[model samples]
Target chain A: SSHHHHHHSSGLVPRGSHMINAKLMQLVINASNDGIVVAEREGKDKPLIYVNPAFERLTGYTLDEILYQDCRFLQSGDRDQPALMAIRETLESGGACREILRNYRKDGSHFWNELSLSTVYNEADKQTYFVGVQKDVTLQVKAQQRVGQLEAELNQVKAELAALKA
Target chain B: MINAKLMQLVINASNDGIVVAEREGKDKPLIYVNPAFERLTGYTLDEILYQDCRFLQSGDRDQPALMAIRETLESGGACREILRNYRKDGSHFWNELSLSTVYNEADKQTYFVGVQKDVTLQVKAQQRVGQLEAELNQVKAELAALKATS
Candidate 1:
């Protein structure tokens, strides 16, 4: 609850408010089962500033592999350029967006990741950084897809039964 | 007094299997079980009674419902509607579990009675409901297309 213009010498809080900085933040990201990452909002061209440990564990990509680089690093050869552009546009407009996008892993395998992106802001500036929460909802997604396929098959069987009755 | 014939009638008629264990040894073992358990789990009463409950484990430890039940009854208390797996015929089934630990007043020892209900049908019903929701949206879209420009 401090004033707006109180830019101190450090431009940072003391190591007093509970182990003070990145360690506290890292604990939160680690506690969550989802992957979280934060980077400088210097446009898509800039690299990531920080990648949580969950990000490394989930994607098998270390901070060295992705830092100072746009998340397009995860995009394999078969990339959906349109969806990336749409995501970038949304972020550029300083808004939050969630979408299911295909991303690759360090092992060069492909998987569906649920990407939820939200923008954080400084008090005076309306735009600041993007908080990206990625979840590996691959198992749930495939289960749903199978349910869809099963329903279609059921419908086909029903249609055949109707034709036979007629 | 709980008689043998009345007990047999209730236990056999119920889908939820029941077992009564008496506190004899330091860690008491299952002493009595009804026929319903044999029907549901394919494990005969001869195979289960006087045995610890660990035989029901399927080694699939990633289940959240199991963990939830674990923490709930870690102090030897009652738990309800906990999802667990029972190994029967080399396959696993959804065993809905409720268990309570009762202590004797004179000897001051505890015994546990457990009831297990098979919930595979109920779980499938909920899954079907979720699948129906997504399909219903597509059905509505098709219906509206027929109505439009009619």
Candidate 2:
């Protein structure tokens, strides 16, 4: 009787509480500006299990079109990246990895994606899944490029001034 | 539910640190922080639970962004600020923090969800660009003056 009472209480209370927690987490993920993706490790490719709205927005792909597909689709046949090798090695080693990748959008445009990948073990399902956090770092990357260009220009200007003074 | 487990996984896996604070508290103390948050701030949940989020600032209180954040919190809105936050080790980081209010339907309570990103590279790059531009302009001016004199 005590066991039955405990079961009933746990069933009713935790269900509601879990729903609230789930809803809150969903809201936070939806609000995130950075792309979030979860992929199941069942298949060889580790097809996508979930993607947040920001991921869809960043890649210009709807959930309907992208579910159950390997995220390497974002590479769009450009698979020779050095980072890809590093990522493969990291994944095989079951370690977290962060890399700046050149990923293509649905419309065939490319952006620099600063991607962080980690794995979560789901005790309930007895499974491990990949969680990817992606940020569009195109602006930062471009800005840094411009900084290099500016440095070169500054050096040239300084050299010219030195020559003029000489 | 499976969704709940998955959601928790997402939070735990996030690259940006996330903190949720309850509005019912007098100081709006933190109720939740993800693993990323712990990694970013170097403070464990045991150390930071129910503590006001201001400890990250660690006495650097002259920021105008702090005033704007206070106003937004009072009026019930969202704000974004690039804050100078110190880690537990005393090293500083530039945190691009986005703070927003959320209401839970089940509990009827409002909470603040703060998303924090480390934008130190971007900020440092911008600063370097500024310095480089100034140097370039000074060099150009000097060259112009040299040419004029010659």
Which candidate number has the best lDDT? 2
Compute the lDDT of residue B128 as modeled in candidate 2: 93
lDDT per residue (tens digit) for residues B1-150 in model 2: 137667676566656677778786568888778778889999976667788899999999998788888888777777767889999999999998777776767778777878787888889878898888888888899999998998
Report the Cα lDDT for residue B29, model 1: 71
Which stretches of candidate 2 lie above 4 Å from their native place? A1-23, A42-44, A76-82, A102-110, A122-126, A159-166, B13-15, B67-80, B141-150
Every candidate's DockQ is: 0.02, 0.33
Write the residue-wise lDDT of candidate 1 on A42-122 in tens digits: 644645666656678778887788787788778765574556767777677766566667788888777888666655554
Go through the candidates in order and give the clash count of each: 3, 0
The superposed Cα distance between candidate 2 and the true structure at residue A22, in angstroms, equals 6.7
The deviation in Å at residue B89 for candidate 2 is 3.7
DockQ, candidate 1, vs. native dimer: 0.02
Which pairs clash in the backbone of model 1? A47-A68, A47-A69, B30-B50
